[PDB]
């Protein structure tokens, strides 16, 4: 299938007036060039292939950057650097989020890819053997690690991927996992109804998708014990929606985000640059 060809047409002098309409109806303008000018025939062989939803979303996009380290930790703070946990979301970054938010609802499978990088913390402490990473998906309810070497990492039921540094970026597919019939990108509501005269706090409660969403947790560690040389790592997480359907289009985000919600920031709500005059070419 191709975009529209243009038919050969000459002029008119007629009671048919396709140039006029009434957009009060809720209909957009419909007229095309052959309605208002003389046109030649032009065969259009061009297609809208690259603007299908699959094409628009058919990219792996970075959604977060995690950090983990491997060294001899002697304090609580340093022990907590030996692993990291991250609530799975697309709101840490802006680019994929904005594209998804052209729509109210979506349904897709997900390809997740990871890019893992290291550097030496210092150069006077020898070297470090090649590191293996564990990336464990912890669904809601499963126990979360409190140490890099606690029992949770045995991962009998949670999916884990073990990645060897220097190997190809690891990758797995995730099905559509929503508990509704589609994902909601926007939810105009709350997780519970506050009732008359109840003693439950109403002053510190939240609103919208943040009150109902939970896609579990990604936990990452270096499996190796410490070397004399401290190694610091970054794990970049990539998401590609595939097998995509979307519903109910929306105006795209026009001003900077300031968090997981639709909220905006007072110093950043003037997207347009003023023109000198209404007559500026």
């Amino acid at each position: 299938p191709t975009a529209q060809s243009t038919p050969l047409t000459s002029g008119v002098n007629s009671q048919e007036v396709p140039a006029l309409t009434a957009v009060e109806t809720g209909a957009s303008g419909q007229a095309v060039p052959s309605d208002v000018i003389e046109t030649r025939h032009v065969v259009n062989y061009k297609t809208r292939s690259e603007s299908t939803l699959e094409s628009f979303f058919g990219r792996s996009a970075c959604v977060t950057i995690l950090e983990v380290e491997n060294f001899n930790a002697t304090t609580d703070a340093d022990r907590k650097k030996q692993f990291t946990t991250w609530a799975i979301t697309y709101t840490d970054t802006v680019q994929l989020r904005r594209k998804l938010e052209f729509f109210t609802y979506s349904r897709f499978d997900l390809e997740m890819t990871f890019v893992i990088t290291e550097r030496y913390y210092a150069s006077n402490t020898g070297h470090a053997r090649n590191q293996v990473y564990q990336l464990m998906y912890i669904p809601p309810g499963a126990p979360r690690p409190t140490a890099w070497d606690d029992y949770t990492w045995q991962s009998s039921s949670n999916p884990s991927v073990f990645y060897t540094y220097g190997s190809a970026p690891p990758r797995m597919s995730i099905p559509y996992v929503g508990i509704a019939n589609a994902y909601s990108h926007f939810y105009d509501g709350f997780a519970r109804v506050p009732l008359k005269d109840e003693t439950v706090d109403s002053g510190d409660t939240y609103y919208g998708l943040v009150t109902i969403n939970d896609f579990g947790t990604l936990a990452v560690r270096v499996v190796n014990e410490y070397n004399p040389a401290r190694i610091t790592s970054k794990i970049r997480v990539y998401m590609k929606p595939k097998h995509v359907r979307c519903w109910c289009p929306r105006p795209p985000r026009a001003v900077p985000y300031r968090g997981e919600g639709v909220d905006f920031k007072q110093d950043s709500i003037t997207p347009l640059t003023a023109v000198e005059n209404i007559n500026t070419f």
Binding site: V23, G26, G189, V193, Y206
Partner: protein, 264 residues
């Protein structure tokens, strides 16, 4: 004889007429309907109140002035206190509904102005404190038939506890997108020289077959003055805007004692 400008709508014991309409919108081209067995979820036999609840309810009118920045309501919130619809809504855990929305605003052949009337699925709006995100109270999110108004200024609160309401900033549609693009949502325009009413028929829209009406509004209704009201003999004149809405194909599941939401 028949005309795009003249329409009658009857639901239950209620009828609307208009003689200066501009067609009618059926959102996303889909008329509302009952929930099919092949898409059903809760298994109890549903209540389908039909004519008791699927009828036109007229909200309190608002006044359009040359200085008005606009109005919003949420649905089913705006109808929560309306006759038997409200009773069926609150006696059940679950409900679904479509709507006929009829917005009314007449003037004269010498007045001018234009209202954009938009039906927005999942109309999530910004909060009014920058100390928190998504920080809106249930009471402020659910004003009922009085709805709310837009403002042309954004003045977030000094303390988080005082900003738990919507920052309904007109040109950002209260949600960080440009209002000029609101036409991607089902809409009509009431342009006073052309028409005196807008009619939108809305199917149920959600990512679920049925949901908790007291927790979740499926649609926002936004009325924005795209071109300000003007009347040469008196620029300070006011004309009413009246909103009348009928639930359609209502269906409820999970009967128990009545829900009474918090009021403060």
């Amino acid at each position: 004889g028949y005309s795009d400008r003249v329409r009658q709508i009857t639901l239950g014991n209620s009828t609307i007429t208009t003689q200066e309409a501009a067609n009618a919108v059926v959102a996303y081209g889909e008329w509302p309907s009952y929930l099919d067995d092949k898409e059903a979820n809760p298994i109890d036999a549903p209540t389908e109140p039909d004519v008791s609840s699927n009828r036109f309810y007229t909200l309190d009118s608002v006044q359009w002035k040359s200085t008005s920045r606009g109005w919003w309501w949420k649905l089913p919130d705006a109808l929560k206190d309306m006759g038997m619809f409200g009773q069926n809504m609150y006696y059940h855990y679950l409900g679904r509904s479509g709507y006929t929305v009829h917005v009314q605003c007449n003037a004269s052949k010498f007045h001018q102005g234009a209202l954009g009337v938009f039906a927005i699925p999942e109309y999530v709006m910004a909060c009014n404190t920058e100390a928190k995100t998504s920080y809106v109270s249930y009471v402020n999110a659910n004003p009922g038939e009085k709805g709310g108004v837009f403002d042309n200024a954004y003045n977030p609160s000094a303390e988080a506890s005082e900003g738990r309401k919507f920052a309904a900033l007109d040109y950002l549609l209260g949600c960080g997108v440009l209002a000029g693009n609101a036409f991607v949502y089902p809409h009509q325009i009431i342009n006073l020289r052309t028409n005196n009413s807008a009619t939108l028929v809305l199917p149920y829209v959600n990512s679920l077959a049925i949901d908790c009406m007291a927790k979740h509004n499926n649609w926002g209704l936004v009325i924005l003055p795209l071109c300000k009201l003007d009347y040469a003999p008196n620029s300070s004149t006011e004309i009413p805007i009246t909103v009348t809405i009928a639930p359609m194909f209502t269906e409820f599941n999970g009967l128990r004692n009545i829900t009474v939401p918090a009021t403060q």
